[PDB]
Symmetry: D2
C-alpha cells in the first residue's frame, strides 16, 4: 500500500522507456521525458511499484512519449471549426511492461491506430460504439468482430468487471497491419504477462485532448472517459515522492 512513486523509481522507469524508444528510433527530445509521461491509473495502482514493473503482475500503469499533437487547424475553412476537435494529428509511443494494462476507456473525438514495434499487444474492445454528443453520426468501416478472449488473462485486482464490456479480442504482433480503433469504442490493452520484453507500440491518432488553445472551444477539453472512476481521476497527474 503506497500512494506515490519514489523519484528513483520514476526516473528509472522513464529513462529506460525513453532509451528503448530512442533505440527503436522514435524521435525523443528532452521535453518528452517529463513528470506526466509515466501514468498510474488510480491511487490503488501505485501498488504496481511494490514489486515493480517486472513482477508480471496486473496493474494499469504505462509510459507515453508524445512526439506530435498537431491541431491541424491552419488552412482549415473557418466553417469547419466546429468539428476541428475530431481531427488533428497525434503520434505517441507507448510502453507497457509485462502483465500491465492501459485501462478500459473510450474517446468522444479521438480515433486511433496501433503499430506494434516490439513485443505483442492484446487488445480488448467493444465492437459496438456508444453515443456521445451528436446523435447523428457517420459510418463507413465499422469495427471488426475480432475473437473471443483467450484463456489465461490476469486482470487488475478490484477492476475486473470494468473489462466486462470489452468482449472482442485481437492479438497484434510486430509487423502486423495497423489496427484502427474508432472513436466512441470501449477499448483497453495489455502486454502478455509472459513477455520477455516490454510492449512498445506507436499510436497514430487524431488530436489528443488531455489537459493557448488552437480554438476557443478546445480549452479545458477532456477526451478520455474511463470505465473505472478511479482511473479517470488519477490519469491527470503522477504522485512522485
Amino acid at each position: 500500500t503506497r500512494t506515490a512513486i519514489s523519484r528513483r523509481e520514476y526516473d528509472e522507469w522513464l529513462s529506460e522507456a525513453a532509451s528503448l524508444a530512442r533505440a527503436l528510433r522514435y524521435p525523443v527530445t528532452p521535453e518528452m521525458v517529463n513528470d506526466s509521461a509515466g501514468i498510474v491509473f488510480g491511487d490503488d495502482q501505485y501498488e504496481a511499484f511494490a514489486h515493480g514493473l517486472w513482477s508480471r503482475e496486473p496493474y494499469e500503469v504505462m509510459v507515453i512519449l508524445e512526439s506530435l499533437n498537431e491541431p491541424a487547424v491552419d488552412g482549415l475553412p473557418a466553417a469547419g471549426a466546429a468539428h476541428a476537435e475530431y481531427s488533428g494529428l497525434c503520434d505517441k509511443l507507448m510502453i507497457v511492461h509485462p502483465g500491465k494494462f492501459c485501462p478500459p476507456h473510450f474517446h468522444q473525438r479521438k480515433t486511433e491506430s496501433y503499430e506494434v514495434v516490439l513485443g505483442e499487444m492484446e487488445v480488448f474492445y467493444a465492437p459496438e460504439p456508444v453515443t456521445v454528443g451528436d446523435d447523428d453520426v457517420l459510418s463507413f468501416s465499422p469495427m471488426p468482430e475480432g475473437s473471443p478472449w483467450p484463456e489465461g488473462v490476469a486482470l487488475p485486482a478490484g477492476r475486473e468487471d470494468s473489462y466486462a464490456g470489452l468482449t472482442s479480442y485481437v492479438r497484434l504482433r510486430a509487423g502486423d497491419p495497423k489496427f484502427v480503433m474508432h472513436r466512441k469504442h470501449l477499448h483497453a490493452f495489455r502486454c502478455p504477462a509472459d513477455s520477455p520484453v516490454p510492449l512498445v507500440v506507436r499510436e497514430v491518432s487524431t488530436y489528443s485532448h488531455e489537459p493557448a488553445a488552437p480554438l476557443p472551444q478546445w480549452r479545458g477539453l477532456h477526451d478520455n472517459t474511463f470505465v473505472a472512476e478511479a482511473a479517470n481521476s488519477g490519469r491527470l497527474a503522477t504522485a512522485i515522492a
Copy 2:
C-alpha cells in the same frame, strides 16, 4: 527517351525498398508492395531509369509504402461531413534515392508531418500558403520562416522553374523532432545527392485523397503539382 519501367526494374526497386522498410521495423504487408507504390511524376520522369536510382541524377520519382489511410469518418457527427475531407489519418514510409525529389505541390486538404528515419531530408517550401479560394481560413501556428537554400542543389531538368516559389529551406536529419507541413503550402523535398543511403521518411498526416467513405470524396485528388506534366500524370506507373 524512356517511356516506361521494365518489370525487372520495378520489382527490384520495390523489393529493396520494402526490405529496407522492414529492416527499419516499418509494418510492411504484401498488399503494400504493389504496382502503384513506385511513383514517377510525369512521363519525362521515366528517364530517371535510364541510368538508375543510384545515378544521383535529379528526377522526380519515389516509393510510397502506405500502411494507413483511415477516413476516420465513423462516429464523426453528420454535421461535420462537409469538412471531414481535411481530416483522417495516413501513415506511409517514403523512400527517395540520392538526388531524387518529391515534386513541388500543395494539398488543399492534407496537412502532413515528417519523421526522418534514415539519411537526411532537404525540404523546400513556401512559408506563405497559396490562396485557392479565399473562404476565411483558420490560423494558429503558421509555417516557420526557414532558411535560404544552401548552395549545390541540382533540380530536375525542365522542372527547375517549378521550385521558384518554394523559397524556404529546412534540413531534417534522422532523430529530429517532427516537422509539420500545413495544408495549402507548396513544398517539395529531396535526398542529398551525396547521400550513402536512400532517404527514408515517415509521413503522418490527414487522409490522402489519391486514386467511397463519403459520397463527396469519390474521385477526389488532393495533390496539385506545380508542373502540369507531373500534375496530369502520376496516376499510374507504366511498367513494361
Copy 3:
C-alpha cells in the same frame, strides 16, 4: 550467357546492400563499398544477373562488407608466431538474395560464427572435418549432428553435386544463438528462395586470409578452398563492365 556485370547492376547491388547494412546499424564506411565486395563465384554464375537478384533463382553470388580483419599479432609472444594465422579477428556482414548461395568450401585456418540479423539462413555442412597441414590437431567441441536436408532446396545449375558432402542442415533465424562453424569443415548456405527480404548475417571469425603482411608467412596466403573448381577461381575478382 554473360561474363560480366554492368557497372549499373554492380553499383545498385552494393549500394542497396550497404544501405540495408547501415539501416541495420552495421559500421559501414566508404572504403568497404568497393569493387571486390560483390562476389560472383565463377564465370558461369554471372548468369544470376540475366534475371536479377530478385528472380529467386539459385546462383552462387553474394556481397560481403568487412568492417574488421585484425591480425591480433601485437603483444603475442614471438614463440606463437607459427600459429598466429589460425587466430586474429574478423567481422563482416554478408548479404545473400532469395535463392542465392555462398558455395561449398572449407578453411584451413578460419573458424567462424554466424548471427542472422535479417531473414533466415539455411546452412549445409559436413559434421566431420578434413585434415590439412598438421596431422595432429586439437579437439574440444566437435560440430553438432544438425538435421537431414529439408525437402525443396533448389541448387545451382551445373554444381549440384558439389553439395553432395554437406549432409547436415540447420536453419538459423534472427535471434537464434550464434552458430559456430569450425575450421576444416565443409559448409555452404543460402537464403530461402521464398524469402521476402535478403538474408543479412554477421560473420564473426578469426583472421580472413583473402588475397604489408603482419608476419612474413602470411603473404599471399589463401585460406578458402572451394569444392567447385569454378568458384575457387572467380572468387578473386569481379568482372564489372
Copy 4:
C-alpha cells in the same frame, strides 16, 4: 554502505538491458540473462545501487551479455596448443549507464575491438603496453596516440588513482569504425554522464578467460585490474 544488490534491483537491471539488446537486434537467449551478467567491480562498488543506475554518479558496474565465447581449439594444430589462449572468439554486448565505468585493467592474452551501437563511448587507455614478463612479443600496428582527456570526467571515488596511467583518450560514437584495444594495454571506458541513453557497445575479441577446452586453460583469469578491490573481487555478484 550497500554490500549487495536486491533481487528486484538485479532483475530490473538485466531485464531492461536484455530488452534494449533485443531492441537493437542482439541475439539474446534465456541463458545469457543470468546472475553473473550484471557485474559490480569491488565490494565498495555496490554503493552505485544506493541511488541507482540513473543517478549519473561515477561507479564501476556494468552488464555483459555474452552471445559467444568460442575457444576455436578444434582443428587447431597441437603444435599451437601453447598459445591458443591468446586466440578464440568472443562476442558480447556491454551496457554501461551514464557516468559508469568499465574499470582500469589489461589482459595478457585478450585483444578486443569496440563497436558502439547506441550512445557514446569514452575510452581511456595507455598507448604503451605494460610489460608482464619480457618474452619478446610481436608488433605490427601499435595503439594510436589518441588525445588528451577532455575536461569534465568524473572518476569513481577511491579509484581515481587507478586511471593515472591511462593517459590516452578516444571518443567513439554510434556508427564509427571498429576500435582495437590490443592485448597488454591498460584501458577503461565510460558512458558520458550527460547521456540520455545507456552506452551499448559490442565487443568482438579473442577468448574471454573468466569464471575445460584445453588443460592449461583451467582456472584461467585473463583480467588484471589496477585496483586490487575490483581485482580480487568481481568473481560473483552478491544478490540479496
